[PDB]
Symmetry: C2
Subunit: 53 residues, 2 copies
Amino acid sequence: MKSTGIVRKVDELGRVVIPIELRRTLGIAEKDALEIYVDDEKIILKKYKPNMT
Amino acid sequence: MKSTGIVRKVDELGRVVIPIELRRTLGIAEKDALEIYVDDEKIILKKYKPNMT
């Protein structure tokens, strides 16, 4: 499990329903955060750094 | 406008609220679709191909 090549809708408020399977791949969650970047034209979602002090 | 290095929550249903600004950058919308992939450990959101026959 990795790249799916799978499209999703951005829902309504601007939240893209990132499939549970994918966020399972990165081991993120809904209450989790994603550190988003963009490579010129494309979006890069990393999982938020789980650094809790 | 491009990479922000900006984190967002995955909401509740599994939809990450991708900031309006970012989707403003890639020319997407909330009714739009995003062709999501993953590079080993990270998520890659491209905007869905606007090819409408």
